[PDB]
């Protein structure tokens, strides 16, 4: 019939052409070099390496919410991340509260730098709520911007008349009171109230008093006393809506109460921030553990080999085959006209497992085995018409399932076949050239060889942008209390409002309760 | 550096209707409101009334609810104050101005101000 | 619907002398009360805010001070430049309402 007649045709040809691959050793791995750049690697430079921009910087003089799907297909040269699409979550508005003194003197005790500043909060804050415009075009007042918030989630009972619910979510330090300035006043034990909540070792979530201070520990900390400073805290705002108009007001209004002197604030441009999708270890151990399983594959696909002049040569060379075979058809995937946003990282392993290592580990064992002592052209010759058709049948055993993989409807097996079957492809062209080229040098060799001044109140560049010294947990774990991700979406920052408080140290001492100079709470390990 | 130039001086029988407009120079009218001013010899400043060019909303005082509208147009940067049935009230100099701190609500910029009178 | 009332409607003063000029709300404005200085050329400027806050480019020699329902306007020495007429302006209430306005005169 005609399967004797195809493979002595078949059989023919391999002896034929192994002859033409054993006769040039540095043309044809010079060919198979330049071609593996030629035919990928200049696409290679478009995909991203993986690092991109997580803050965006937006000026405040006009503002408006980027476009969600005005565009098909964004434009490569936008400078707006990939991330800046939709509107953002809230709006951020933070009010710095820095305070200062009048000449300090003895009399004065530890608690006074708490009580004094905190004791303006509570009339900042209903100052802040009770504002409204008096000749406005759109909105009036600040309910209707804020960001209502109904509960916090279950299991949080603890924090309950500590944080803001029912209501817009405004954060201020007179949540420890629950802004009652008479219950404020009532409390004996100022310092231990606020510190009532603080954990006792470090914990990556925010403190519940770093959450209401919004501000970092080292302005609110009770070791300021020792060195005449004051606690300075900040009241946040969180805004559903972006009303220009609004902000501009409550700006001017809050300047106009508490005016603050050699104050020269940029307020220039809007901070955006993007929150990734933390990925935790119970997402990677099958990751490595497929890794690790993946080089046990390739260790026990070497080693059972025996070379006549090396000993790990050609198996770092059948190596060197699948990963080169790999990373080209990554690429020409592109040039197929199929998407290449398949994530790759966990694709590698079962690629190279589906590619596997018997068509390239099969030609070795006759090309060994050839008797020819002398002649190489010759043992390419007889091990290579040994291995006629074997690793043709292989390769066409392995690669007939993946049409059957990807006639199926699924996009990501479909893409995963896709790139299985132009592996495969190169794989064999390289196997045909590349590997057999070196294994005829190495034949080639063998035979060859053988006085005491109260700090000021300074508005200097440090004082904005003071979010970022917070905790990198701070805004997702405000906002997880209430049942609101930031996991696929993005936060703006509006630029701080500066607030000035000038205090008498005659009012400490009319107001100095009795048993003032103990409390519970000792700063820890400090 | 910002002007707020007005048109000339008007002279219409009673009856008609006149259009005053003002042209702002050295900024855009959509930053800002604009106001409209009647200054009578002796009556004293008047305050007729306001626009939001970047919006459009309007508001009056109640004597000139129905006596004076306002309009403007952010392409040619100008507002427009009309006054319909002119009677011999209205003799008087109107004032053009925008206010920049939105608590305060200061009237910073005024315009040269237009005489209108009104006579047979 | 607040009136603003200036009962001076004159008040000579001499050049090189301190000059005060009061108004009196209707009702209070929490310090919300603007000057307005116009010049007989007709040009109308501002010269103090809120209640006593200075606008830019006004000398100092112009302040600002009240409460409640009285206000006052001080001038530090007479300049020829200051002789105009002062209006007082509140912005508290939405139909913001001018006073009645006062002219500076010198001694004869």
């Known amino acids: 019939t005609l399967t004797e007649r195809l493979r002595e045709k078949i059989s023919q040809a391999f002896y034929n052409h192994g002859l033409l691959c054993a006769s040039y050793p540095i043309p044809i791995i010079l060919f198979t070099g330049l071609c593996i750049l030629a035919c990928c690697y200049p696409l290679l430079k478009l995909p991203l390496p993986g690092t991109g921009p997580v803050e965006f910087s937006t000026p405040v003089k006009d503002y408006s919410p980027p476009p969600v799907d005005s565009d098909h297909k964004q434009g490569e040269p936008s400078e707006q991340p990939e991330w800046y699409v939709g509107a953002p979550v809230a709006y951020i508005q933070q009010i710095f509260v820095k305070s200062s003194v009048s000449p300090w003197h003895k009399n004065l005790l530890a608690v006074d730098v708490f009580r004094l500043p905190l004791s303006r909060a509570f009339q900042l804050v209903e100052e802040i709520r009770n504002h409204a415009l008096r000749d406005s075009s759109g909105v009036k007042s600040l309910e209707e911007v804020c960001l209502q918030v109904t509960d916090l989630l279950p299991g949080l009972r603890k924090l309950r008349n500590l944080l803001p619910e029912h209501g817009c979510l405004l954060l201020s330090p007179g949540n420890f009171w629950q802004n009652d300035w008479e219950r404020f006043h009532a409390d004996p034990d100022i310092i231990g109230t606020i510190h009532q909540h603080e954990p006792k070792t470090l914990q990556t979530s925010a403190t519940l008093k770093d959450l209401l201070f919004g501000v970092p520990g080292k302005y609110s900390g009770v070791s300021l006393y020792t060195r005449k400073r004051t606690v300075s805290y900040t009241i946040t705002l969180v805004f559903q809506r972006y009303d220009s108009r609004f902000l501009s007001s409550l700006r001017s209004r809050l300047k106009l109460l508490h005016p603050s002197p050699n104050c020269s604030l940029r307020a220039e441009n809007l901070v955006h921030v993007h929150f990734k999708e933390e990925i935790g270890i119970a997402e990677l151990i099958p990751l490595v553990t497929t890794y690790i399983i993946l080089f046990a594959y390739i260790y026990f696909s070497t080693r059972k080999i025996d070379m006549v002049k090396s000993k790990w040569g050609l198996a770092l060379a059948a190596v060197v085959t699948v990963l080169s075979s790999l990373l080209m058809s990554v690429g020409l995937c592109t040039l197929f006209g199929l998407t290449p946003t398949l994530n790759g990282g966990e694709i590698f392993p079962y690629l190279v497992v589906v590619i596997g290592l018997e068509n390239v580990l099969v030609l070795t064992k006759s090309v060994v085995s050839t008797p020819v002592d002398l002649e190489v052209k010759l043992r390419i010759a007889q091990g290579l018409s040994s291995e006629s058709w074997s690793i043709m049948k292989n390769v066409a055993t392995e690669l007939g399932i993946i049409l059957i993989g990807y006639f199926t409807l699924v996009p990501a097996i479909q893409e995963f076949c896709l790139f299985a079957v132009v592996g495969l492809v190169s794989d064999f062209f390289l196997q045909m050239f590349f590997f057999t080229t070196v294994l005829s040098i190495d034949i080639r060799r063998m035979e060859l060889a053988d006085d005491s001044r109260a700090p000021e109140v300074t508005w200097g560049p440090e004082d904005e942008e003071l979010w970022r010294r917070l905790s990198f947990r701070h805004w997702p774990t405000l906002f997880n209390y209430y049942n609101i991700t930031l996991a696929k979406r993005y936060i703006s920052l509006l630029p701080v409002i500066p607030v000035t408080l000038r205090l008498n140290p005659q009012e400490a001492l009319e107001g100095r309760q009795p048993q003032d100079g103990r409390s519970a709470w000792a700063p820890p390990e400090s | 550096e910002v002007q707020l130039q007005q048109s000339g001086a008007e002279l219409v029988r009673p009856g008609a209707s006149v259009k005053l407009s003002c042209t702002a120079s050295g900024f855009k009218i959509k930053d800002d409101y604009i106001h409209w001013v009647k200054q009578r010899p002796e009556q004293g400043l008047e305050w007729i009334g306001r626009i939001d060019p970047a919006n459009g909303h309007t508001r009056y005082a109640p004597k000139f609810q129905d006596k004076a509208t306002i309009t403007a147009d952010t392409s040619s940067n100008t507002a427009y104050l009309q006054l319909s049935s002119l009677t011999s009230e209205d003799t008087a100099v109107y004032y053009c101005?925008?206010?920049?701190?939105?608590?305060?609500?200061?009237?910073?910029?005024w315009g040269q101000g237009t005489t209108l009178t009104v006579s047979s | 619907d607040i009136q603003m009332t200036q009962t001076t409607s004159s008040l000579s003063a001499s050049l090189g002398d301190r000059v005060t000029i009061s108004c009196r709300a209707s009702?209070?404005?929490?310090?919300?009360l603007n000057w307005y200085q116009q010049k007989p050329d007709g040009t109308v400027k501002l010269l103090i805010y809120?209640?006593?806050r200075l606008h830019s480019g006004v000398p100092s020699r112009f302040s600002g001070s009240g409460s409640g329902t009285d206000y006052s306007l001080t001038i530090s020495n007479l300049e020829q430049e200051d002789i105009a007429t002062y209006f007082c302006?509140?912005?508290?209430?939405?139909?913001?309402?001018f006073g009645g306005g006062t002219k500076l005169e010198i001694k004869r």
């Open positions: 809120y209640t006593s």
């Open positions: 101005t925008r206010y920049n701190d939105y608590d305060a609500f200061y009237f910073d910029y």
């Open positions: 302006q509140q912005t508290n209430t939405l139909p913001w309402t």
């Open positions: 009702q209070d404005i929490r310090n919300y």
